[PDB]
Amino acid sequence: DPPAPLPLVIWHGMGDSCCNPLSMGAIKKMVEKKIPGIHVLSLEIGKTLREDVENSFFLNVNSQVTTVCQILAKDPKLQQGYNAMGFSQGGQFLRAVAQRCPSPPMVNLISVGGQHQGVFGLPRCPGESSHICDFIRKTLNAGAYNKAIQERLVQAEYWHDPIREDIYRNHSIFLADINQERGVNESYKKNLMALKKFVMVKFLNDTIVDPVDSEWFGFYRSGQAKETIPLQESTLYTQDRLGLKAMDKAGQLVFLALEGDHLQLSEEWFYAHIIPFLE
Ligand SMILES: *[C@H]1O[C@H](CO)[C@@H](O[C@@H]2O[C@H](CO)[C@@H](O)[C@H](O)[C@H]2NC(C)=O)[C@H](O)[C@H]1NC(C)=O
Ligand SMILES: *S(=O)(=O)CCCCCCCCCCCCCCCC
Ligand SMILES: *[C@@H]1O[C@H](CO)[C@@H](O)[C@H](O)[C@H]1NC(C)=O
Ligand SMILES: *[C@H]1O[C@H](CO)[C@@H](O)[C@H](O)[C@H]1NC(C)=O
């Protein structure tokens, strides 16, 4: 009976699609293996898998969230609650969904390598001992925060410059909004706390996401881009603008970690740590 099965909604990462046998499709089958009967819905933004991949890079995130919200609404099997799992950027997009459209009600949210505080660095380009890598990211500010670019580029919409944070607060059309940087949105806080379990999976040896702490809602300490601080230590948590400190208090936040590069997980680990939150 439906009580037993809780529907699962999946949102893929950048460069991926909803239904490729080697990636989403593979998680879809693994989940169907152990959760008999579960109804899985792998989101597809666009009419074809060609527009899907393309949209993961070039379609305004805010516009994608409105679209998926409409999709979840038109699906009857979801109206009584549904778990969601986001891979990579799919993690923060799905969190936006949770904060913006509370019906149907999302239950458990699984973030597999998501960037909740965005990013500030290029993949495989560590700025510690590299002048060129550091130069770029810092110089891409004017680019990333340009009005036109900030609306036609997905990754720009969650690019978070810690040095010139005022510009990021004033120009980010996505991450800054769902992160309450300008003003505390009441429905966002309440809608996020309405979740039962928010799981943040983080790959300890990630070289694609800079900084890796963003996977556990942490980030570079303001004013610079070398040292990072944990969520519990940031003012988002301190003033509890999203209800993240209250939730943590109530045991609604789970911090998972495992050795590996971005999105590197075995069929075993997946069975031993993710399937639970779905069964
Ligand atoms: C993967 O790379 C990380 C480096 O990011 C290794 O480091 C672990 O975590 C931090 C740094 O991330 C270190 O201070 C710890 O000492 C490391 N953990 C251990 C085992 O002590 C991590 O060990 C690497 N593991 C793999 C897969 O190579
Ligand atoms: S996942 O594969 O969906 C996760 C995304 C991980 C971070 C990698 C994205 C790096 C984006 C670099 C571009 C920033 C854009 C600046 C544009 C200025 C013109
Ligand atoms: C919160 O955000 C929503 C979605 O953008 C917006 O419509 C609304 O005006 C904001 N305020 C509240 C508390 O709903
Ligand atoms: C963005 O908005 C703030 C608040 O009005 C104001 O200081 C200015 O217009 C912008 N801030 C900076 C320095 O980017």
Side-chain angles (χ1 to χ4, degrees):
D1 303 335
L6 251 187
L8 168 65
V9 166
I10 296 171
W11 195 335
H12 66 77
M14 82 175 150
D16 202 355
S17 65
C18 82
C19 359
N20 182 280
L22 282 297
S23 56
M24 284 313 91
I27 261 61
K28 167 112 139 290
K29 302 296 286 187
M30 295 174 82
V31 166
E32 283 170 343
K33 305 283 185 179
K34 299 189 180 180
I35 299 300
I38 189 171
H39 189 270
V40 183
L41 176 58
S42 188
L43 303 170
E44 184 194 5
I45 316 303
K47 305 98 76 308
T48 76
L49 289 174
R50 200 279 207 305
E51 296 181 351
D52 204 15
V53 174
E54 185 193 315
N55 284 343
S56 75
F57 293 111
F58 309 112
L59 180 57
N60 173 296
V61 180
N62 290 311
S63 288
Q64 289 186 50
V65 174
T66 303
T67 295
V68 312
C69 283
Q70 299 190 184
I71 297 178
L72 301 182
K74 297 186 173 304
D75 183 354
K77 293 200 183 72
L78 304 176
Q79 302 311 297
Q80 216 49 56
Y82 73 84
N83 290 313
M85 190 170 53
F87 297 77
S88 214
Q89 68 193 16
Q92 58 257 43
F93 298 176
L94 222 38
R95 177 181 133 243
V97 168
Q99 298 178 192
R100 292 174 183 172
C101 57
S103 187
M106 194 192 290
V107 186
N108 281 6
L109 171 54
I110 314 294
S111 176
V112 198
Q115 306 92 60
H116 300 289
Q117 275 289 16
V119 303
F120 187 69
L122 294 298
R124 301 269 189 170
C125 220
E128 290 64 57
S129 77
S130 305
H131 173 79
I132 27 172
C133 287
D134 190 48
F135 175 60
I136 304 170
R137 77 174 173 185
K138 292 186 182 181
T139 63
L140 261 47
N141 178 296
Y145 299 91
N146 169 288
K147 224 284 185 304
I149 289 294
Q150 178 65 204
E151 284 178 1
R152 186 248 306 153
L153 189 51
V154 169
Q155 291 63 42
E157 303 177 356
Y158 60 77
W159 180 265
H160 184 178
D161 182 352
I163 296 170
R164 303 148 76 178
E165 283 209 289
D166 40 9
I167 295 162
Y168 151 71
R169 296 200 178 87
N170 298 350
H171 299 293
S172 177
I173 73 172
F174 189 87
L175 191 69
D177 176 64
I178 70 183
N179 273 14
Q180 311 276 58
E181 295 289 12
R182 306 184 186 74
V184 173
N185 182 300
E186 186 175 62
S187 66
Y188 285 4
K189 179 119 119 74
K190 165 188 55 185
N191 291 327
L192 189 72
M193 291 176 82
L195 293 178
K196 267 65 181 76
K197 269 189 173 61
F198 176 25
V199 196
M200 284 167 275
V201 178
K202 145 155 147 290
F203 304 85
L204 301 155
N205 332 94
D206 209 308
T207 57
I208 306 301
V209 178
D210 186 359
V212 287
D213 319 62
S214 185
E215 287 167 52
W216 272 5
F217 236 131
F219 203 68
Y220 283 121
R221 196 162 80 283
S222 181
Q224 54 78 61
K226 169 91 68 183
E227 187 203 314
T228 58
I229 70 171
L231 166 65
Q232 301 90 322
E233 233 155 292
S234 62
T235 92
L236 161 69
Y237 188 87
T238 273
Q239 292 183 1
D240 190 301
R241 306 197 312 274
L242 225 37
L244 243 279
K245 175 173 60 171
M247 289 167 86
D248 192 30
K249 168 179 168 54
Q252 301 177 234
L253 300 174
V254 183
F255 294 80
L256 295 176
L258 69 161
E259 190 180 0
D261 205 351
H262 190 81
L263 298 180
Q264 194 170 8
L265 60 77
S266 48
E267 186 178 1
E268 189 180 1
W269 195 91
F270 186 75
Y271 294 153
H273 303 281
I274 302 307
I275 282 299
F277 294 110
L278 305 176
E279 37 177 27

